[PDB]
Structures are given as structure tokens and as C-alpha cells.
Amino acid sequence: LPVSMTKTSVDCTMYICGDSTECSNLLLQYGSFCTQLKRALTGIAVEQDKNTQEVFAQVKQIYKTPPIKYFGGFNFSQILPDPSKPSKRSPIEDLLFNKVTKGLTVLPPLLTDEMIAQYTSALLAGTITSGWTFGAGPALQIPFPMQMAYRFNGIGVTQNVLYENQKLIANQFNSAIGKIQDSLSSTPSALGKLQDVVNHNAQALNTLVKQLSSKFGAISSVLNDIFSRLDPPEAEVQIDRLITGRLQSLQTYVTQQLIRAAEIRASANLAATKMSECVLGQSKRVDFCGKGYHLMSFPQSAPHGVVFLH
């Protein structure tokens, strides 16, 4: 699920007029268009930051897994942080990170990748050591087999079913984790949503930049060329045509950015709901936290998004 896109900002006067002061003076007659563009882009950026905050900052505590990582035969090494790795990212998180790759500026996000990794690690530690109790109050520890017996009892299967064949269930879970790692490492188009986000942003910026070389019905697309080859009285006309074209292009870009921001906000709200209702608890809503009867979910951070292991 995508969560946020890149925070972008545009220099209106620099984009449209280069280094010409007469062009800026002419632009001054058009009102506060650049002000509206700045306000829209600032709103989009703060919205992206809020999206990340609502999706990932669900806990006020940073929980730690015990040094002795034995959970009744359940193997969690593929999703727990790797101390050997300098970035402290889980192997699945590392694979996810690897598999996803003027006048215009890109603002860095407020939360670095290390902070989101710490949030996901806290979520995993809380949901492993304390079950779902940490999402509703103080974290109360419970042995993992008993937590899984709770979760089996949640879906209408008695405790003895799990307790009598615990080893088989643990082996199946470990095999499933290995298989999902292999499936992510093999299928190339599994991460298509985040890549489409990145590609859409890059294409929009490149199109906006490429539009700057369009004549827009004028004699030339170079501002200094017009200012150096023509006298004023028709120079104002030519420059007016150029600048009105460039305002049209920039306004179109801002409108598409607003629409895409709304779409990403809807996706981020869905991701936050999924986090709350599948990671912090067990969900009876069918087909909401995976196909079949839901037991538990594990979050993994990804570039511009989040990955859920149902």
C-alpha cells in the first residue's frame, strides 16, 4: 500500500522567467498566482508528512525483543531487525528497499528511513511479546504459544487443536515465511504500486521541465533571444504569450499533483486502518487482512509505502 509521495516545491518566477527582471515585472501584473501555487504545494507536503505520521506512529512506546529469541519453535528472523546490518533493517525490508528504485526542488521527508524502521520494529516487538494487549493499554506479556491459542480460539477452533500439533504449525509458518521471501525476491512486478508512484512523479516533473522549451505560438522559446532581437512594443506581446503558456503548464501540474495527493491520502488512510485493525488486533472482517481466517499480521516498511504480511 502506498503511503506518501515526494514533497516537491517549485520556484514560480525562476521556472517561468530565468534571470530576466522585466519578465518578473510583467509577471507582477498577473496577481498572486505563484502564491496560490506555493500554498497548494505546502499543503501537499504537510499532508504527506501527516500521512506517514498517522500510518506509522501508532505506539507511544519503543518495545524491544528479548535477547533470547525462542518463541516455541516460531522463527521470526526474516522480519526482525538485523543487528549485523548497519541500517538495522530486516531481510525482507532490505529486499523491499533494494527492489524499488531548474526551478524544481524536492523536499526531504520529515521521518527518515531509520525512524520508520524503528517504528516497525517496535510494532513487531509489541505484537510478538505482548500479543494485542499493547494496542489497548499497557503491554502485558504472554507466551507466544498461548497467544496463538488465543488467536485460534478467535476463529472458532479450540485450544487443544493448536496445543496438540504446535510443531506442525510452527513448521508451516516458517515454510510460509521462507516462501514469501522467495516470491518477493523472484517475481519482479510484485512491488508495482510504489514503483508507479515514483514513475508518475518523475514523469510529471520531466514533462513540466520539457514544456519549458515550447514556443507556445511565439517566434522563439528563448526569453533572452526575444529580449535581444526585438524592440519593446511587440516584445511585451511575445513575452506575454510565453508567460501565459507557462502559467497554464504550471497550473496543470499543480492540479494533477492535488488529485494524486488526494488519491495517496485515501491509500494512506486505508493503510492506517489496516495497521490498526490487523496488526494491533485480530479482525473478523473477511478478506480485509488477507484471504482466509485472519490470525495475525506483521508490518514491513517500504519506500513510499508499507508492506503487510498477513
Ligand X SMILES: *[C@@H]1O[C@H](CO)[C@@H](O[C@@H]2O[C@H](CO)[C@@H](O)[C@H](O)[C@H]2NC(C)=O)[C@H](O)[C@H]1NC(C)=O
Ligand Y SMILES: *[C@@H]1O[C@H](CO)[C@@H](O)[C@H](O)[C@H]1NC(C)=O
* Region 45-74 residues binding ligand Y, contact defined as CB under 6 A: 68, 70
The minimum distance between CB 49 and ligand X, in angstroms, equals 35
Query: Across the chain, which distance is largest between two alpha carbons, in Å?
Result: 93
CB of 280 to ligand X, least distance (A): 21
Residues 255-284 contacting another protein, CB under 8 A: 255, 258-259, 262, 265-266, 276-277, 280-281, 283-284
**Segment 120-149, which members bind ligand Y (CB under 6 A)?**
none
Residue 16 or residue 139: which is nearer to another protein going by CB? 139
User: What is the binding site for ligand X (CB under 6 A)?
Assistant: 75, 77-78
Q: Does 13 engage in binding with another protein (CB under 8 A)?
A: no
Task: Give the DSSP H/E element, type plus range, for residue 114.
Answer: helix 113-129
Rounded Cα distance between 185 and 78, Å, is 13
Site for another protein in 166-185 (CB under 8 A): 166
- Cβ proximity to another protein: between 166 and 195 the closer is 166
Question: Interface with another protein by CB under 8 A: which range of 88-96, 129-137, 184-192, 204-212?
Answer: 129-137
Side-chain half-sphere CA neighbours of 94 within 13 A: 15
Q: Is 213 helix (H, G, I), strand (E, B) or coil?
A: helix
* Binds 77: which of ligand X, another protein, ligand Y, none (CB < 5-8 Å by kind): ligand X
Task: Identify the DSSP state of 71.
Answer: B
* Amino acid at position 106, single letter: V
Amino acid at 162: L
Interactions with another protein, residue window 48-87 (CB under 8 A): 49, 57-66, 70-72
Q: Report how far residue 127's alpha carbon sits from residue 255's, in angstroms, rounded to the nearest whole number.
A: 41
Closest CA relative to residue 135, chosen from 146, 144, 126, 124:
126
Residue number with CB closer to ligand Y (68 or 291) = 68
Positive/negative CA dihedral, 116, 122, 125, 131? negative
Nearer to another protein, 35 or 187 (CB): 35
Binding segment (CB under 8 A) for another protein, from list 13-21, 80-88, 115-123, 207-215: 115-123
Gap between the Cα atoms of 47 and 7, Å rounded: 9
Question: By Cβ distance, which residue is nearest to ligand X?
Answer: 75
Q: Which does 96 bind (CB under 5 to 8 A by kind): another protein, ligand Y, ligand X, none?
A: none
What is the Cα Rg of the chain in Å? 26
Per the listing, cell 508495482 goes with 192
Q: Which residues bind ligand Y (CB under 6 A)?
A: 68, 70
